Amino acid sequence: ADIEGAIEDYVSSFEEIGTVIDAGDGIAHVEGLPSV
């Protein structure tokens, strides 16, 4: 019930910094940056 609202609220909330989690030979994966 409140989960949908609560979860939705989260999506809504979103100078923002992400972090590299993988990297290799040209391709790098960056977690975060929700508004990229």
Place this chain on the structure above:
Amino acid sequence: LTNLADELASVAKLLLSETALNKHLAEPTDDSAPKVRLLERLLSDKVSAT
């Protein structure tokens, strides 16, 4: 301690049931504020403090 165990089991059940809730409460984001905000919002008054 018994209440703490029961409430921790209850939140475990909630996380298992709400897969989306578990996934955002588990995202590897460094920002904790948003997460904690979702947390309390959905469970702050329903569980003890400890």
